[PDB]
Write an enzyme that holds these catalytic residues in place. Structure first.
Site, short mmCIF file in Angstrom:
data_model
loop_
_atom_site.label_atom_id
_atom_site.label_comp_id
_atom_site.label_asym_id
_atom_site.label_seq_id
_atom_site.Cartn_x
_atom_site.Cartn_y
_atom_site.Cartn_z
N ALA A 31 -5.00 -4.39 10.31
CA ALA A 31 -4.06 -5.21 11.07
C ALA A 31 -2.59 -4.94 10.75
CB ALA A 31 -4.36 -6.66 10.81
N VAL A 35 -2.80 1.63 6.06
CA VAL A 35 -2.15 1.34 4.79
C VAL A 35 -3.05 1.45 3.56
CG1 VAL A 35 -0.92 -0.48 3.54
CG2 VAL A 35 -0.52 -0.15 6.00
N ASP A 165 6.33 -8.25 8.63
CA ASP A 165 6.55 -8.15 10.08
C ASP A 165 7.67 -8.95 10.73
OD1 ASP A 165 4.03 -6.55 9.89
OD2 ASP A 165 3.97 -6.83 12.07
C1 LIG Z 1 3.49 -1.18 3.90
C2 LIG Z 1 4.16 -2.07 4.85
C3 LIG Z 1 5.38 -1.56 5.48
C4 LIG Z 1 6.26 -2.36 6.34
C5 LIG Z 1 5.84 -3.74 6.55
C6 LIG Z 1 6.51 -4.76 7.45
O1 LIG Z 1 6.21 -5.94 7.33
N1 LIG Z 1 7.39 -4.36 8.37
C7 LIG Z 1 8.14 -5.12 9.29
C8 LIG Z 1 9.47 -4.60 9.51
C9 LIG Z 1 9.27 -5.72 8.62
C10 LIG Z 1 4.63 -4.27 5.95
C11 LIG Z 1 3.78 -3.46 5.10
C12 LIG Z 1 2.71 -4.19 4.47
C13 LIG Z 1 1.41 -4.49 5.01
C14 LIG Z 1 0.38 -5.03 4.12
C15 LIG Z 1 0.53 -5.31 2.69
C16 LIG Z 1 -0.48 -5.75 1.73
C17 LIG Z 1 -1.82 -6.17 2.11
C18 LIG Z 1 -2.92 -5.36 1.59
C19 LIG Z 1 -4.30 -5.67 1.90
C20 LIG Z 1 -4.66 -6.80 2.73
C21 LIG Z 1 -3.55 -7.59 3.24
C22 LIG Z 1 -2.15 -7.31 2.96
C23 LIG Z 1 -1.16 -8.20 3.57
N2 LIG Z 1 -0.15 -5.85 0.36
N3 LIG Z 1 1.21 -5.55 -0.11
C24 LIG Z 1 2.22 -5.14 0.79
C25 LIG Z 1 1.86 -5.01 2.18
C26 LIG Z 1 2.88 -4.48 3.06
#
Ligand SMILES: Cc1ccc(C(=O)NC2CC2)cc1-c1ccc2c(-c3ccccc3C)nncc2c1
EC number: 2.7.11.24
Length: 343
Positions: A31, A35, A165
């Site tokens: 989702a 990653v 996000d």
């Molecule tokens: C890598 C990345 C890059 C950019 C943005 C972002 O929000 N960009 C928008 C412009 C602001 C978000 C992520 C993101 C996604 C999932 C992450 C989980 C994680 C791991 C497993 C299950 C669930 C989660 C949430 N754990 N730690 C950090 C996490 C970071």
């Protein structure tokens, strides 16, 4: 100097990252994009690496890529996800076809927590506090999240939280609406930053009660569900809806009074209920801000005006320029090699 990259197939594509990142491993979510959890031996931290999907397939994606990168490099707050790094295997623009992002890792999100822990009053405060504090930062840079929800809150083992996000446009073609603010869902007049507070409210109410506050089915059901708690709008709010159809339709519904939050949230820190009535108000204008919310006596044990920072102004001026698919691509490149890791 340019680091030494290695290759492996993770999530069905070629992953080429610098050797500092070791033990890459898919999260199982999907989702959030493609990653992996990794260990950065440079900082010694557990990180989260995300390979951008065909970042430049079209103007929409191109600009979307540069937009996210701009946002990530700009945000530097302990309660907002930020960039620990960003890299590309490419040695020159000519090649450049993929962008990789790196952030601190948490491993979970709020959504996947109500089903586990029973959540004591204390932990709720800590979690709502972090959302408001990070929100205050985000808001100061003149950036609105617009779609805040439990699945966008990255939380780790020690109930420490990071908002994800934020500031990412809208949708194409759907989208959960269990937390979106009504102003948005029925599209009314200009809508301020307070849209996010509405969401914090829903979340807070969820963390207190264990059940979703407004799990509507479709669009009218959601509005049905919310008006049954906060009540239908008076003439004050209706007159401010500088819309049309939405105003004439909203007032069509049966009038309803606001319920008594106290008996709706049976048994719950009274200070908690006080905060909910200040967040879940139909009128955004009369709704509390993140800064104001951090002073409320409910967060008494965590509040500290000096340790609740603000952002610098975000230069959102690119959001109006019309550019070619190749130019948006180039700027994303410029943003990538001009990047400087934080201390
Ligand atoms: C890598 C990345 C890059 C950019 C943005 C972002 O929000 N960009 C928008 C412009 C602001 C978000 C992520 C993101 C996604 C999932 C992450 C989980 C994680 C791991 C497993 C299950 C669930 C989660 C949430 N754990 N730690 C950090 C996490 C970071």
């Amino acid at each position: 100097e340019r680091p030494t990259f290695y290759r492996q197939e993770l999530n069905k594509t070629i992953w080429e990252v610098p050797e500092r990142y070791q033990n890459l491993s898919p999260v199982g979510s999907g989702a959030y994009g493609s990653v992996c959890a990794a260990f950065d031996t440079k900082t010694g931290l557990r990180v989260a690496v995300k390979k951008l999907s065909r970042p430049f397939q079209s103007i929409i994606h191109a600009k979307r890529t540069y937009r996210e990168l701009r946002l990530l490099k700009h945000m530097k707050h302990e309660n907002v996800i930020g960039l620990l790094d960003v890299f590309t295997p490419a040695r020159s623009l000519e090649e450049f076809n993929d962008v990789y992002l790196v952030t601190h890792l948490m491993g979970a999100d709020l959504n996947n927590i109500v089903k586990c822990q029973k959540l004591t009053d204390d932990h709720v405060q800590f979690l709502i506090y972090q959302i408001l504090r990070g929100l205050k930062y985000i808001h100061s840079a003149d950036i609105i999240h617009r779609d805040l929800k439990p699945s966008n809150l990255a939380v780790n083992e020690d109930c420490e939280l990071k908002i994800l996000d934020f500031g990412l446009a809208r949708h194409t073609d759907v989208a959960t609406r269990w937390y979106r603010a009504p102003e948005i869902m029925l599209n009314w007049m200009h809508y301020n930053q307070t849209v996010d507070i509405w969401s914090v409210g829903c979340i807070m109410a969820e963390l207190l009660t264990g059940r979703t506050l407004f799990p509507g089915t479709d669009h009218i059901d959601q509005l049905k569900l919310i008006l049954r708690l906060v009540g239908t709008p008076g003439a004050e709010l209706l007159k401010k809806i500088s819309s049309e159809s939405a105003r004439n339709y909203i007032q069509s519904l049966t009038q309803m009074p606001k319920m008594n939050f106290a008996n709706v949230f049976i048994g719950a820190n009274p200070l908690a209920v006080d905060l909910l009535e200040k967040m879940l108000v139909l009128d955004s204008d009369k709704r509390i801000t993140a800064a104001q919310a951090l002073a409320h006596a409910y967060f008494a044990q965590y509040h500290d005006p000096d340790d609740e920072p603000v952002a610098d102004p975000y230069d959102q001026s690119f959001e109006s320029r019309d550019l070619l698919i190749d130019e948006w691509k180039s700027l994303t490149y410029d943003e990538v090699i001009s990047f400087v890791p934080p201390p």
